[PDB]
């Protein structure tokens, strides 16, 4: 009977593969919001490790949790961890492209969407986060996400959202979306709207439940309410989740192979 | 009974990465110790350069010079090496000029203090531990300045975050041998100790909310953050412990934290001079 049920928990063959990372300055929410994506689709330690998760959804979608990079005294290549992890992927991902095994399907590790944490200070983007930025949006797929919204009066997110999409804008930072890439009228109609009102998307992270009007739902109850995650009252974490794994899943993986992945091929023969 | 001049001066620093609520608390700080007034609308400019405000206050009936000096924030460069070095310069500034005006060739009864006597130490509220930087940081300035630690934003946690955040931030602090004020070396007797130990152990480091606007609750206008949830009230102790590091460094070690500035780190930069 023991030995029975070990089996069922081996087990689901899956159609494709969806791989989402999130990288920031520790204390930031990150792991939070990880477990926060996993249980929207159903004490945390710090991170210090690079750990990818996975779960089926018919989609294998696997999240990347990262221990914090750029929260140092000296911060000079701090990306590089990651920039080894992402190449990684593309290297195994090439070599399993060739196919000399003859696969029907090749399962696919390569990190299709990279969400970068930015915290909320009301102030100018740190120096130190464009750089990271800079060099991660050269080969992957970056969306900005303001960490711990929750810190914010509604004001002081709306002053703030504005603040970073100006100084992406000036400061020549590529993040997905990317116009270049719209196809047709309907693709910037729905886009530019992203751009200028839904991003950065400033998220609200729990995978504590709470009932609420008499629903279970993912909150984070501090003391002076319950805030409800997937209320789009209360935080922007549905308009994310809903862009990364409803609307432009399948835009992000198009990207991914076809323009960051053929420069690493292009780069590498 | 009552005059016009002031009985004496006492300087704060806040210091801190930026973004943590720094130059709001120092508004904040002055509107506790004052009326109907509007709200400030726009918003506080990054602090981007070291600035000393003033203002005569009261407290229990006596007059002081408080002046608080506002610092521009640090660690988010790619390299932040010696990032404290132009704070540590304007407190050595103001040990020079001490010594300088101290000799009193003009014969004045009262010397001008323009010396920090209490450094603020902001400090995110992020759950894990410390930042490296945060902790070379204090360890530099403790040396030179009385500080205090203080958790900012600390409406960012839960009760039971914030519990263990202090607790970590202190464990932090003690094993790294940072001497923040009340320094235990300094404790000079039994008594002293005790009432110390009890500050360093569960007071410290407090967890600040900062607002210097004003909000009406339950028919009273106070201090607070407006939030879609409520008014989380500055000087309410259920909501923040705002109020027990102002009454800590405005009335109870007031003197205190003037004599430890004087005697010990005012002297030892004396005699290194
Ligand atoms: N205020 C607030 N705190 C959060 C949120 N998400 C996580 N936290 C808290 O922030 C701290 C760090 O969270 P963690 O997930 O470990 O962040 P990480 O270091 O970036 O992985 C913990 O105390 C969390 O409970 C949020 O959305 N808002
Ligand atoms: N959540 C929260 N936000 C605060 C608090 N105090 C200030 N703020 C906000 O934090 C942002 C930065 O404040 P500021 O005083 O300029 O910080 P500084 O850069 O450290 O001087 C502003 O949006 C403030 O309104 C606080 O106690 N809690
Ligand atoms: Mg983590
Ligand atoms: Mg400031």
Not at 96 to 124: M, Q, W
Not at 136 to 163: C, G, H, W, Y
Not at 237 to 248: K, N, P, S
Request: neutral net charge; hydrophobic residues 35%.
């Amino acid at each position: 009977i023991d030995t029975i049920i070990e089996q069922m928990r081996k087990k689901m063959k899956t159609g494709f593969d969806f791989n989402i990372m999130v990288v920031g300055q520790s204390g930031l929410g990150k792991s939070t919001l990880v477990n926060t994506l996993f249980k929207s689709q159903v004490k945390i330690p710090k991170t210090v490790e690079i750990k990818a998760i996975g779960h089926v959804i018919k989609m294998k979608l696997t999240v990347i949790d990262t221990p914090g990079f750029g929260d140092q005294i000296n911060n000079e290549n701090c990306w590089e961890p990651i920039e080894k992890y992402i190449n990684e992927q593309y290297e195994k991902f090439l070599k399993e492209e060739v196919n000399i095994a003859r696969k029907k399907r090749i399962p696919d590790t390569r990190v299709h969407c990279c969400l970068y944490f930015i915290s909320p200070t009301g102030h100018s983007l740190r120096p130190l986060d464009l750089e990271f930025m800079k060099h991660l949006s050269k080969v992957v797929n970056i969306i900005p996400v303001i960490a711990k919204a929750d810190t914010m009066t509604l004001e002081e997110k709306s002053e703030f959202k504005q603040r970073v999409r100006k100084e992406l804008e000036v400061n020549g930072i590529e993040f997905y979306p990317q116009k270049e890439f719209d196809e047709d009228l309907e693709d910037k109609t729905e886009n530019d709207k992203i751009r200028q009102e839904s991003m950065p998307f400033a998220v609200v992270g729990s995978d504590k439940e709470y009932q609420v009007n008499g629903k279970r739902v993912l909150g984070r109850k501090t003391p002076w309410g319950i805030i409800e995650v997937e209320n789009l009252n209360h935080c922007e974490f549905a308009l994310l989740r809903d862009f990364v794994i409803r609307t432009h899943l399948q835009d992000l993986k198009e990207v991914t192979h076809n323009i960051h992945y053929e420069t690493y091929r292009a780069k590498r023969l």
